[PDB]
Scaffold this active site. Structure first.
Site, short mmCIF file in Angstrom:
data_model
loop_
_atom_site.label_atom_id
_atom_site.label_comp_id
_atom_site.label_asym_id
_atom_site.label_seq_id
_atom_site.Cartn_x
_atom_site.Cartn_y
_atom_site.Cartn_z
N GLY A 147 13.23 -1.95 17.17
CA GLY A 147 11.79 -1.98 17.07
C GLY A 147 11.17 -0.61 16.83
O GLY A 147 10.08 -0.53 16.27
N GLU A 188 11.43 -0.26 13.16
CA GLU A 188 10.44 -1.16 12.59
C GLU A 188 9.04 -0.57 12.69
O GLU A 188 8.24 -0.70 11.76
CB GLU A 188 10.55 -2.53 13.25
CG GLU A 188 11.86 -3.22 12.92
CD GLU A 188 12.08 -4.50 13.70
OE1 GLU A 188 11.71 -4.52 14.89
OE2 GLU A 188 12.60 -5.49 13.12
N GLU A 210 21.26 -3.92 14.57
CA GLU A 210 21.30 -5.20 15.27
C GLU A 210 22.57 -6.01 15.04
O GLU A 210 22.98 -6.76 15.92
CB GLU A 210 20.09 -6.03 14.86
CG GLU A 210 18.77 -5.63 15.53
CD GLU A 210 18.04 -4.48 14.84
OE1 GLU A 210 18.57 -3.87 13.89
OE2 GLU A 210 16.89 -4.18 15.25
#
Ligand SMILES: CC(C)(COP(=O)(O)OP(=O)(O)OC[C@H]1O[C@@H](n2cnc3c(N)ncnc32)[C@H](O)[C@@H]1OP(=O)(O)O)[C@@H](O)C(=O)NCCC(=O)NCCS
Ligand SMILES: CC(C)(COP(=O)(O)OP(=O)(O)OC[C@H]1O[C@@H](n2cnc3c(N)ncnc32)[C@H](O)[C@@H]1OP(=O)(O)O)[C@@H](O)C(=O)NCCC(=O)NCCS
Lengths: 261, 258, 261
Positions: free
Chosen positions: C112, C115, C135
């Site tokens: 994240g 991201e 991931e």
């Protein structure tokens, strides 16, 4: 007596190496070779066994010199259409496969040869690698996806340079514009490509496959639609046992062991 | 006097914006003549490549004519932008290949003109920029779309939101300029690039250009179907057969555009 | 206790600097961090003053490590779903905001955190910057749009490399591929990122915001549709005082004074 070059297949468990064994015509793709490639892609895509395939050409001169122009000389228009459909189906099947495909570019990759490399997920270039979409110098256009896949990687200006001039570029130029992911030292192409395959295979099988498909299936989508597509795939992968193994292995300060489910 | 000088060489022409006193700006008159030139070369396959450059060593094109713009009501601005859109799209739809030879500053609309061309060559001291936000506007000649498609959206946001200049080394490194030219050799290099394209088969070059552009924004299966439709444009040509015969005879092909 | 906030917010007129104040936890996106982040985005979007924001992590090791997995293991199912949904909403709000967001990448970005960097408009990389979407090592895929945001920024070949091999991208490569817009010298990250923000805010306020959205909303459109979108966006500046001031300043050979109207 008929000219029937074919593939060598070297199986290494979850990884296979497929070698175009057609040096007398610089590893050009004949009708029968393309049929065989498509069949092999279909079969590996029906295994979960095989999670990465490296494709390479025999020798140090050519990865693949394109379609076999000796065979093509007298092919009728419908036969050309059938061949282009074979390229389309085969290259799309590479993209749709859960298996990751790596092109180990050992020499010239011209026309259809570059198109094969572009259909793969990743590309490794040896010092002798040379790439080009030379079709306009033959009176044709790229008909194996090159007008689409090249621009997706390098943008329309660089794609127009390569496609409209038909010029050839070397390994490091390909790397620098995002056409080759790795540059192998002289003599080490297959070791580098195999190590790249190993780096993929150590990851969770469904996660690798799902991420690959999320990337390609987002082609041409507007952002909201692309985000919704990723979310659907993310929700699906939440239901896999390997997802839970990743969390358990982290909670236990140990390496995960993934099973592909 | 005409807004452009035209140096015709048969299958290749060189067009020079002849507007040094306003730094080769896109006045309405300049834009109208550009459209007439594009229409002419697009009306047959006889002219296959055009190099566009600016007169002098200061500007390729300083953008829309801001002195004229000061006089324009809102509907006139819309009409100018519509004509700019149409002319840049006509460059893309043309079978002729367009090469921008960037001889000096290309700013705003001037960078947009360069982006509408198929290929770009820059002189060592040339600079590009989409300076619109520094003028209180946005790129309205395709810059917000074509630049991102060319250099990526992050680089496009940098250039468009900062309004900074990009020099020749940076432009070449990121592929905004496809070639650089030594000083005094800009047109020789751009003409040589034209000649390199013109060596290739005429219908194939034009069809390939259009396959690349028309695939913009398509999902993969649709894009691949498009390419196969385009291949039909060369499948029934004599030049396709010449490529195969030349290969068989281990000789250079000589194409005829049919 | 004094309830130390999750962010330090340095208001500098038209620019704010947000520092994730989580160095001992790798500047992770805890529930509390996410809550504040979302409210900060809302606040600057409604602020007339604030036109650009620099986001950075405290220290030299982590920009943002993504979700805090220790906290995650304590969360109920509904809380996890709400966290993921809120993360996605916050990234989308950054994108839709008129405010320009610059990620000043001071260290590792993962999950994240990567991201978040990708949701920003611009990125600056310190020498310690490293970004990953790793991931697939965990049996999952990015859950906050990372696959699509990465592929739209760097293309599918580079996105497949990073995501399928789970390797990090460092500063020089990030710059080469357009992921990092600037490389900052050691010790100068915030000066470089702040200077980049200053260069944006020199320009006309409505024009900058409109141009941001024109760029972002055009991706995935076919060309004619994209050009029509740009002309619709042009309507947002056509009736502004600042457009007329740009023309007057040019005519009068002086600097323009923009007002955001
Ligand atoms: C690959 C290449 C760079 C290697 O160069 P090289 O080592 O000097 O090898 P040669 O060009 O002498 O070719 C060796 C043999 O391979 C054949 N060959 C090469 N490419 C071929 C192809 N695409 N189809 C069929 N045969 C091919 C040659 O005709 C020759 O065989 P021959 O002597 O029996 O006629 C060169 O063969 C080449 O450029 N091939 C491309 C041909 C082509 O136009 N492909 C189209 C892509 S759009
Ligand atoms: C191109 C440029 C770098 C060259 O610099 P230079 O050689 O020092 O030339 P100057 O800036 O002194 O301008 C010379 C003449 O060209 C005119 N000119 C320059 N750009 C013009 C434009 N886009 N429209 C109309 N006239 C223009 C100047 O007004 C000036 O006219 P004048 O002699 O009657 O006073 C400089 O003119 C420039 O930066 N122009 C940008 C203008 C602009 O903002 N365009 C739109 C981008 S969104």
């Amino acid at each position: 007596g008929p000219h029937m070059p074919e593939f060598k297949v070297d199986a290494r468990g979850p990884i296979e190496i497929w070698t175009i064994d057609g040096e007398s015509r610089r590893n050009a793709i004949s009708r029968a070779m393309l049929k065989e490639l498509g069949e092999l892609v279909t079969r590996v895509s029906s295994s979960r066994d095989v999670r990465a395939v490296v494709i390479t050409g025999a020798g140090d001169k050519a990865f693949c010199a394109g379609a076999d122009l000796k065979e093509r000389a007298t092919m009728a228009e419908d036969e050309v259409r059938a061949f282009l459909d074979g390229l389309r189906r085969t290259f799309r099947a590479i993209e749709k496969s859960d298996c990751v495909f790596i092109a180990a570019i050992n020499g010239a990759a011209l026309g259809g040869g570059t198109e094969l490399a572009l259909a793969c997920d990743l590309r490794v270039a040896a010092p002798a690698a040379e790439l080009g979409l030379t079709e306009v110098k033959l009176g044709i256009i790229p008909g194996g996806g090159g007008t689409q896949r090249l621009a997706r990687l390098v943008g329309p200006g660089r794609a127009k340079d390569l496609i409209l001039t038909a010029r050839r570029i070397n390994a490091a130029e390909a790397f620098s514009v995002g056409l080759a992911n790795r540059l192998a030292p002289e003599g080490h192409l297959l070791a580098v490509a195999y190590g790249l395959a190993e780096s993929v295979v150590e990851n969770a099988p469904i996660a690798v496959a799902t991420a690959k498909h999320a990337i390609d299936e987002g082609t041409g989508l507007e952002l909201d639609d692309a985000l919704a597509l990723e979310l659907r795939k993310y929700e699906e992968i939440l239901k896999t046992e390997d997802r839970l193994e990743g969390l358990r292995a982290f909670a236990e300060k140990r390496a995960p062991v993934y099973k592909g489910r």
